[PDB]
Design a protein around this ligand. Structure first.
Ligand SMILES: [Cl-]
Ligand SMILES: [Cl-]
Lengths: 21, 142
């Protein structure tokens, strides 16, 4: 895992927020 | 779907190669490919610590590997899909593959590749096609 998925999700989202059109 | 499988193999092969491991030895079995490689490189460099967390907290073994993979990916995508989460997904599988080889569980490489391609084709493809397919990804991340 829960914590590992959470880490990946939050970082994926920050990455997404920067690059999203 | 065959193009998706080929995308998974391209990424995993690249990430293995960066660690000095060849696809031909360790698997028992173009603009999009390049964008994903670059996005993967950037994601992993920027959040290196998250990937050491993964290999320290989860001791993969062939018997528990599938259940653990599916639990991580299901939680990752629990409330939706976006490009950032997709990049995290590819990077996660890449890390798992390299970890498997380091730990002498290299039979898992082709299995992880299969689990990723299945998840991509069944569960991520609907969102990807609804959002302009992989060419859109190339636009934003290439
Ligand atoms: Cl941490
Ligand atoms: Cl959630």
């Amino acid at each position: 895992x829960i914590w590992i998925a959470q880490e990946l999700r939050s970082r994926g989202d920050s990455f997404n927020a920067y690059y999203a059109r | 779907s065959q193009s998706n499988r080929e995308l998974v193999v391209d990424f995993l092969s690249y990430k293995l190669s960066q660690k000095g491991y060849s696809w031909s030895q360790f698997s028992d079995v173009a603009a999009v490919k390049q964008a994903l490689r670059e996005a993967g490189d950037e994601f992993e460099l920027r959040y290196r610590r998250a990937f050491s967390d993964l290999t320290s907290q989860l001791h993969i073994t062939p018997g528990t590997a599938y259940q653990s993979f599916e639990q991580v990916v299901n939680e990752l995508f629990r409330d939706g899909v976006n490009w950032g989460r997709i990049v995290a997904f590819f990077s996660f599988g890449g890390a798992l593959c390299v970890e498997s080889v380091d730990k002498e569980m290299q039979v898992l490489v082709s299995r992880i590749a299969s689990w990723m391609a299945t998840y991509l084709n069944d569960h991520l493809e609907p969102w990807i096609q609804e959002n302009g397919g992989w060419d859109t990804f190339v636009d934003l991340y290439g």
